[PDB]
Structures are given as C-alpha cells and as structure tokens.
C-alpha cells in the first residue's frame, strides 16, 4: 500500500454517509495507508458532543493541512424533531469555513459523453466563493410585535457611537437580522481570485449588488480594484486577460449565455446558489468539485458541494433502488489526497489520486453511469433501467476498473 | 381612438428612454387616448427633484391603480462622477415597490422560432418575487475600524430591551448591515403565490435558506405552510397540484433541469437574480414580463425587468448602429393597459392590449427580429446583419403589423 500520511476525515449523514463508507472500502484503503484522523460529523454525534466535534475537526485541519469532508445535515425545526436534538445546531460547513477562512473554489467534472443543459458552455466555469461572513455568520431573530430594530456601531476608541434605524414596526411583527464581513477576509478573497485567474489563464469577474448595498458591496468592489491596480494589473496585461466587476443579476445572465472559460468571484451566498446552478447546467450536482483553499496557501478542505441527498436516502430506507452519483464524494478524497501528495512530494500518492479521477471519467465515458447522468443523455422520460447502474453497482464497477488500472501500472 | 383611461407613466434612462418614446408614438397613442400622467424618472430629473419625482409617481399609482415604468438608472459611485449628482440616489424600483408592496411576477415571452439556452424548458417558469424588504430596504454601513456592531430591539409597550451581538471587530474594519421583513407582507406574498398557482394550474415552490437563516427564513417557510394548510391545500389537491418548500440551492438546480410549468416563490433578492437567469435561459433578457401585483388586488405596476442597456446606449452616443430588443418595454404597456381595461370593463382596451402582444410574437416568428433573437437562432458568431433588424426598423415593422391587425 502507498503510505499517504496524515489526513483529516469527516463523516457525514444519510445517503452520503453510506457512499462515504463504500469509497473508503472499495477505492481508498485497499491501496493507501493513511494516518486518518477521523471525526464523526453525523448529526447524532454532533448532538452528543454539543457540536464540539465540529470545532475539533477544524482544528485538526489546521494541524495536518488536509481535510476531506462528507456532506452533513444542517438542522431546522423538522430535523430537531426527527433526531430529538437539543438545539438547532449551526451548519458544520459554516463553522469549519469560519475558523479556516479562504475561498471555496467549485468546478464541474466534465465527461465528453454527457450533454449539458446549457448549450454554450464549451469551457469550464470556475466559481471562487468567499467562505466567510454574510448570511453564514449572521444574527437573525423574529420580531414579536411593534417596536424599533436598530443596528449600532461602537468604536473601540474615543466614543463616536452611531445608531442606524433598521425598521420601526408600527403594527405586527416580522424578522430582522444583522450580518457583517471583514476587510482582511475580503482582501484574502481578492488575492485568491486574482491568483486563480492568472494560474488558469482566464479572465476574472466579481459579482456584487453594489447598486443596492452601496457601502456593504461597495467595499468588495473597491478592495478588488485596489488590490488589482497595486499588485495584479500588470500580470493580467502580460497574460492577455482582464478583470471586471459586474452586478450579480447581470452576471448570471452573461454566464448563462457565455461559452465558459472564466473565473467567477462570488460573495458567500451567491457562491452557494450559483455553484449549484452551474453544476446542474453542466450535468449533475454529483459532478462538481469543491475545495476550500486557505489564505496560508497550504491548507485545504475538499468536499462534495451537494447535500446529503435525503430524498434518495428516503427511497433507500423503504428498500427502493437508488442511483446516487458518488463522483463528487470520490473527488473530495482524490483532491484531498492530491494536495497531501503535493505537500510531501509523494510521487506514488499523486499518481494514485490522478488514477482514481481517471477511472471515474473513463467509466462514465464507457457507458457506465448513475441515473442522473443517464438522464442527461437520454432525457428523463426516455430513460430505462438498462441505461444506468444503481448506487452499489456503479461503485462496484469503479472498484473493478481502479483495481485493473493500478495492476497495470 | 380607444378611450384608455387613467394611467401613470414613468420615463427612464439611456437606451430604454429612447425605445420608450418610440412605443408611445408608434404603438399606443395613435390608437389609444389616455389620461396620461407622465413622470420623468430619468436620472437627470431625479437629481433635479432630489428623487421627489419617484415618490410622486408611486403615490400616483396608488390613486390610479395602473403604472407603466421604463428601465431606470440606479447610480453607483462611478455614475455619481459621470453626471455629477448630489448623492448616490436609491433605486427608484426599490422606492416604488416599497410604497406599493406586493409581488413582482416575472415570466418569459416565448416565440416558436427562438431556441433556448436551457434545453428542457418546454413549459413556462413563473417567478413570484417578493417586492418588500430584505436587501432592498436595508441599512448598510462601513465599519471604519475595531469596535462592536450590535442590533437591538425595543418593544413599543415599554417592556425590556434585547441586544444581540453581531460582530466584535477586534482588528481592522469591514462592513455591516441590518435588514428586516414584515409578517403581513410575507402573508400577502404567500397569498399571491398560492393564488397564482391555482390560477395557472401549476405547482408552487418556495425557496429559502432556513437551514442557515433559521429564524429569518424560517418565518417565510412557516407562514407559507400555515397559509397553505388553512386556506389553499384543499384546492391544490382538487387540481392535482402541490406546494413544497425547497432550499434555494436545491431549487435553482431543480429549476435548471425541469421541464417548466411551475410557480416559483422567491424572496426579494433571489427573485431579482434568478429572474434574469431564467429570462436569459429562455432566450433574451428583453423577452420577459414583469408585473408588480399589490396586496389590495386592484393596483398594478408593469415594468421592463431588464436594465437600461448602456452598452447599446454608448454605441448610440457614438453614432453606431444598435439592435436593442423593445419587447419587454412594449409588454409593460400592454400588461398595464390590460389591467386598466379589467378595472373599467373596457372591452376595446382589453382587445388592444392582446393585439399588441400578438403582433410582437407574430413578427418574430415571421423572421423579423432584433440581433439578440437572431443570435439565439444562428449563434452570435454566425449572425450577419441581413439576419436581423436594427432597433428602429423592428419597431417600424411592429407599427405596420399592429395597424393591420387592428383594422381587420
Ligand atoms: N455540503 C453540505 O454539507 C451540504 C450542502 C447542501 C445541503 N446539505 C444538507 O443536505 C440535506 C438535504 O438538502 P437538499 O436535498 O436540499 O440538498 P441535496 O441533498 O444536495 O439535494 C438533493 C437533491 O438534489 C439532487 N442531487 C443532489 N446530489 C446528488 C447526487 N450525488 N446524485 C444524484 N442526484 C443528486 C437530487 O435531486 P432528485 O431528487 O431530482 O434526484 C436530490 O434529491 C439538508 O439537510 C442540508 O442541510 C449539506
Ligand atoms: N428594472 C430596472 O429599472 C433596472 C434593472 C437592472 C438594472 N438597471 C439599471 O441599468 C443600469 C446598467 O444596466 P445593467 O447593468 O442592468 O445592464 P443590462 O441592461 O442588464 O444589459 C446587460 C447586457 O444584457 C443585454 N441586454 C439587456 N437588455 C436587453 C434588451 N432589451 N435587448 C437586447 N439585449 C439586452 C445586453 O447584451 P449585449 O452584451 O449583447 O449588449 C447588455 O449588454 C444600472 O445602473 C442599473 O441601475 C435597471
């Protein structure tokens, strides 16, 4: 077996938790020896530890520089009842990203045989999603009745306290929230986006809504311009690429009619939403990579961008055949292992991480596919059961195809 | 000429302001006589009136129940320099939607001969965008340096204050903002969405992020469920349709791969962003309806959902040929006139509003179209100037076909 090194692993929930075991059992552990630091981020063990396991996992990623994460449940009211939880725990992803910081870079996994839903996307679209702040570290509450909601800033220095009226509720109640972001975090966000654009050789676009959030989003736009003009403007010219700020609604329209081949710097919320749209446009939520690259340049957290796929977990619980796509969870392992190999100049691990990705593509392009991708080719009404493999047949086929590729080399 | 009635009109900026005139002079007032109350909401007069023109127009819509609005400029810092304005004026749309409230219903305008960019959308997607609150009535500010940002609630009855920590900036500054929403507005939002689904015969989906905004977005989710179970669930089952809540990121993916045929209840921000994504998916940003339906059930504001097309306006300024799609601006008039005809039982005006929309569709499907629609057919690189009409020849042909349809 290859000696892989130290890797922080985080277990998830429902359908992805099951696929996670198959990946470890059929594709990884037979060929790689790892100092696997495992953290159960399943909903029950997060509840049992009062979510401390989530903060422990984040700290381990700081120590060992590589984390691979399975999709997890973020509970609302209906999940508190289903699992008898103590409280509505925050998203484990929000907690992990808030401790590490950085940019979540997402990108579709492309197969030559899979038609897109968007006709023009002949090149990849890479989304750089800011991983900090905004709605994912906000403080929201219900306004019970009439009253004023105000937002106040108290400076650390000589007091110049400022009180802003949010809304005076004259009758009835409602909702209110405050959210924030950090100058330093936005600077890291900008650097990560300019570097990625230059590294790939593609233009870079940043989307905000600064016409409406004039000071909030205007900070994002200004900091990108300043960093561009001071550190990156010349290297952009030398590579024959450009940087441009666009309104977010203009940007989604341009992306929809684009040919692809650009970097898309997104604020936290838009990066969430638009990365599922892009992934689905290219084929399936199961065909997309997601890597949190930290500002240190050395630490990464690879993950599946999709959720736990509970709707498929429901069918599995009623003993109905499931055809869930494991590729995004598999590429979380391979991308994490690839970065682990790059930190240690591990030749054998680099080759294994590439071979494991090559096996996924080669298998799909040969006609062996989960139902989601078979629907891309034939159209959902024209799909028969012969057109695809169930969840377990597909991972059986990847396990066989990987064993053969590794036996050959 | 037809006796149209009282209609509030709001002029806009740049390329849309040019197109707006052409519509009035070629397609409306030659055939309709209207008590037209015109408000110049262009950036020039909004500055001159200190945006009092925008508040005046919104008040006029409340009295006369029908407003038609041209696309306008929302100024950034970079447009304060271009016209040397007093301040960064707020969005006239936000101001108008805030005074009226309600839901902005958006839907693509379909033509037989125009391929989509999204393969599977064979049925219409209608987005119901909540028009009140959230980012569009928010208070944002720059955090200059280290300090504490808190949000407070003081009840009116004099009971105890509650303060929540937003963020303690230990080093450096950043940004912060507060935003809110109102129960009654959410209820009106929910009623309009269940009713529209029942009117169209399609299922209804609401998108929020209640796993993250547990109390803020949970309120939206809970109020829809309560209104569904108590008032609309039984009529839904009788019509073989349904309502379901979905997280926004799952929702945008489902919509992308769907066949269409559903109502999409969106919060203010998502309704903004996603309606331009859907419009571009079907063909072009200029082929989309946008109608603000107020909770009172009588007043309505139709608009062009797109922007002012400044890229074409720059070419227009530099004396270069343009090919801008006027149909969204044309439909704002027809939708406005149609509702005016519904309130006055004006059979003739009802017919005129439909004839004007049919002529637009019939024109494109006969092969006479703007460049954006020609690019949908041939692909933008393979489009020649013989493949399309410019902005002014296209509205010339619409004038001819509309006069012929009305005479016959
Ligand atoms: N990274 C994360 O940890 C993360 C991200 C998002 C959501 N979540 C959590 O996951 C739970 C479910 O959320 P959700 O259902 O809204 O999001 P989701 O699990 O990503 O959505 C599942 C739906 O999207 C499609 N889909 C997603 N992944 C797929 C795959 N690998 N193969 C085939 N189809 C796939 C399926 O649509 P069809 O039903 O049409 O097959 C499925 O029903 C929630 O509790 C949420 O908190 C976690
Ligand atoms: N409803 C409103 O009043 C509204 C909404 C949004 C923005 N705005 C304002 O508009 C100003 C700038 O405009 P924007 O950023 O929104 O740009 P935009 O008008 O969305 O135009 C962006 C691109 O979309 C295409 N496009 C849009 N409308 C079109 C039409 N009717 N026919 C053909 N092509 C069309 C053009 O594509 P090409 O690249 O092919 O030219 C154009 O370059 C902003 O200051 C903002 O305040 C107003």
DSSP B79-129: HHHHHT-SS-PPPHHHHHHHHH-SEEEEEEPP-TT---SBTT--S-EEEEE
CATH for B312: 3.40.718.10
Q: Are residues A71 and A16 in contact, defined by beta-carbon separation less than 8 angstroms? A: yes
Q: Ligand 1: does its nearest atom lie under 6 Å from the Cβ of A308?
A: yes
For chain A, how many structural domains are there in total? 1
The structure's method of determination equals X-ray
Question: Cα B120 to chain center, whole Å?
Answer: 24
* Interface subset of B 308-367, CB within 8 angstroms of A: none
Q: Which one, of A253, A254, A283, lies nearest residue A361 by Cα?
A: A283
Resolution for this PDB entry, in angstroms: 2.5
Q: Which token pair is B99?
A: 């005074």
User: Which residues of chain B from 151 to 210 reach within 8 Å of chain A, CB to CB?
Assistant: 151-157, 164-167, 169, 171-186, 209-210
The rounded distance, in Å, linking the Cα atoms of A50 and A395 is 34
Residue B120 Cα distances to A75, A213, A379, B117, angstroms: 33, 35, 9, 9
Other Cβ atoms less than 10 A from the Cβ of B84: the count is 8
Contact A154 B177 (CB under 8 A): no
Q: CA-CA distance, A148 to A134, in Å (whole number)?
A: 23
What counts of helices (H) and strands (E) characterise chain B?
A: 15, 14
Identify whether the C-beta of residue B61 lies closer than 8 Å to the C-beta of residue B299.
Answer: yes
Of B144, B151, B248, the CB nearest to A176: B151
Residue A337 sits in which domain range? 1-409
A231 Cα to chain B: minimum distance (Å): 21
Contacts of A393 (CB under 8 A, 6+ apart): none
CA dist A315 → A233, A305, A321 (Å): 53, 22, 7
Whole-angstrom Cα distance, residue B264 to residue B255? 9
User: Do the annotations mark residue A249 as ligand-binding?
Assistant: yes
As a whole number of angstroms, the distance between CA A25 and CA A163 comes to 57
Q: Which token pair is B290?
A: 């946008």
Residues framing ligand 2 (Cβ under 6 A): A 211, 247, 250; B 71-74, 93, 284-286, 303-312, 324-325, 328, 372
B183 contacts in chain A (CB < 8 Å): 172-174
Best CA proximity match to B243, nearest among B210, B300, B204, B187:
B204
Give SS3 for B379: coil
| Bridge-based pairing state of the strands A300-304 and A288-293 | antiparallel
Best residue in A117, A161, A328 to probe B by mutation, most B CBs within 10 Å?
A117
Q: Rounded to 5 degrees, what are φ and ψ at A179?
A: -140, 165
A185 labeled binding residue? no
Query: What's the order of all strands across the beta sheet hosting B162-169?
Result: A162-169, A147-155, B147-155, B162-169
How far apart CA B143 and CA B156 sit, in angstroms, is 29
Tokens of B127: 């987005």
Rounded distance between C-alpha atoms, residue A341 and residue B44, angstroms: 60
R_g of chain B, CA atoms, integer Å: 22
Atom of ligand 1 nearest to the CA of B254: 40
**What stretches of B144-261 adopt beta strand conformation (E)?**
147-155, 162-169, 174-182, 204-208, 243-247
Tokens at B385, concatenated: 């100037």
In terms of C-beta density within 10 A (0-12 exposed, 13-18 middle, 19 or more buried), how is residue A87 classed?
A: exposed
Cβ neighbours, 10 Å, residue A122: 12
Euclidean distance between CA atoms A151 and A354, whole angstroms: 51
Query: Phi then psi for A235, rounded to 5 degrees?
Result: -65, -30
CA distance B281 to chain A (A): 7
Specify the DSSP element, H or E, that contains B371.
Answer: helix B371-378
Residue nearest to atom 5 of ligand 2 (CA): B307
How far is it, in rounded angstroms, from Cα A388 to Cα A392?
A: 11
Rounded CA-CA distance B352/B375 in Å is 30
Name every residue whose Cβ is closer than 8 Å to that of residue A184 and which is 6 or more positions away in sequence: B171, B172
Instruction: Indicate yes or no: CB of A252 within 8 angstroms of CB of B277.
Output: yes
DSSP A229: I
Label residue B341 left, alpha or beta by phi (over 0 means left) and psi (-120 to 50 means alpha). alpha
Rounded CA separation B52/B46 (Å): 7
| Residue of B67, B109, B307 to mutate, ligand 2, most atoms within 8 A of C-beta | B307
End-to-end CA, chain A: 14
Contact criterion met (CB < 8 Å) for A118 and B120: no
What span, in angstroms and rounded, lies between the C-alpha atoms of A176 and B183? 11
For ligand 1, whether the C-beta of A292 sits within 6 Å is: no
CA B243 to chain centre: 23
Cα dihedral: B128, B130, B135, B138 (round 10): 170
Identity of the residue in B77, B173, B277 whose CB atom sits nearest the CB atom of A253 = B277
In chain A, which residues are followed by a C-to-N distance beyond 2.5 Å, i.e. a gap?
A: none
Q: Give the residue ranges of DSSP H helices in A178-299.
A: 183-200, 216-227, 233-238, 248-257, 268-282
Measured between alpha carbons, how far is B216 from A242 in angstroms, rounded to an integer?
Answer: 39
Q: How far apart are CA A272 and CA A180, in angstroms?
A: 17
* Terminal alpha carbon distance of chain B: 15
| Helical (H) or strand (E) element with B302 | strand B300-303
Distance CA(A196)–CA(A106), nearest Å, equals 12
Residue A246 near residue A206, CB atoms below 8 Å: yes
Nearest-Cα distance to chain B for A268, in Å, is: 12
Q: Is B393 in the pocket of ligand 1 (CB under 6 A)?
A: no
Q: What is the DSSP letter of B249?
A: H
Does ligand 1 lie within 6 Å of residue B250's CB atom? yes
B395 touches chain A (CB under 8 A): no
Contact B257, A376 (CB under 8 A): no
Q: B118 and A118: CB-CB below 8 Å? A: yes
Q: How far apart are the C-alpha atoms of B246 and B210, rounded to whole Å?
A: 9
């Amino acid at each position: 077996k290859i000696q892989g090194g130290s890797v922080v692993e985080m277990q998830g929930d429902e359908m992805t938790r099951i696929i996670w075991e198959l990946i470890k059992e059929k594709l990884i552990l037979p060929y790689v020896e790892l100092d696997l630091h495992s953290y159960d981020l399943g909903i029950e063990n997060r509840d049992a530890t009062n979510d401390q396991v989530t903060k422990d996992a984040a700290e381990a990623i700081k120590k060992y520089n590589v984390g691979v994460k399975c999709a997890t449940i973020t509970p609302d009211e209906k999940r508190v009842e289903e699992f008898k939880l103590k409280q509505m725990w925050k998203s484990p992803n929000g907690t992990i990203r808030n401790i590490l910081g950085g940019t979540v870079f997402r990108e579709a996994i492309i197969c030559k045989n899979i038609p897109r839903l968007v006709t023009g996307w002949v090149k990849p679209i890479i989304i750089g999603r800011h991983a900090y702040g905004d709605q994912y570290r906000a403080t929201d509450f219900v306004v019970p009745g009439p009253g004023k909601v105000e937002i106040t800033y108290t400076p650390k220095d000589g007091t110049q306290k400022v009180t802003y009226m949010v809304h005076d509720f004259e009758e009835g109640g409602g909702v209110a929230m405050g959210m924030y972001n950090q100058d330093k975090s936005i600077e890291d966000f900008a650097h990560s986006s300019f570097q990625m654009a230059l590294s790939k050789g593609w233009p870079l676009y940043l989307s905000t809504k600064n016409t409406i959030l004039k000071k909030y989003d205007g900070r994002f736009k200004d900091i990108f311009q300043e960093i561009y003009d001071k550190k990156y403007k010349s290297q952009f010219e030398a590579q024959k690429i450009c940087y441009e700020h666009r309104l977010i609604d203009d940007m989604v329209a341009q992306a929809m009619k684009s040919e692809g081949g650009f970097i898309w710097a997104c604020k936290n919320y838009d990066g969430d939403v638009q990365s599922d749209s892009v992934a689905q446009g290219y084929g399936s939520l199961g065909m997309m990579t997601s890597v949190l690259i930290c500002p240190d340049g050395k630490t990464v957290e690879a993950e599946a961008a999709h959720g736990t796929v509970t709707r498929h977990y429901r069918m599995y619980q009623k003993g109905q055949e499931t055809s869930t796509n494991p590729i995004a969870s598999i590429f979380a392992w391979s991308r994490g292992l690839a970065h682990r190999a790059k930190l240690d100049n591990n030749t054998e691990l680099s080759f294994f991480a590439k071979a494991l990705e090559d096996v996924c593509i080669e298998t799909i392009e040969a006609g062996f596919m989960t139902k989601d991708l078979a629907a891309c080719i034939k159209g959902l009404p024209n799909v028969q059961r012969s057109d695809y493999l169930n969840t377990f047949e597909f991972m059986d086929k990847l396990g066989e195809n990987l064993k053969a590729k590794l036996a050959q080399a």
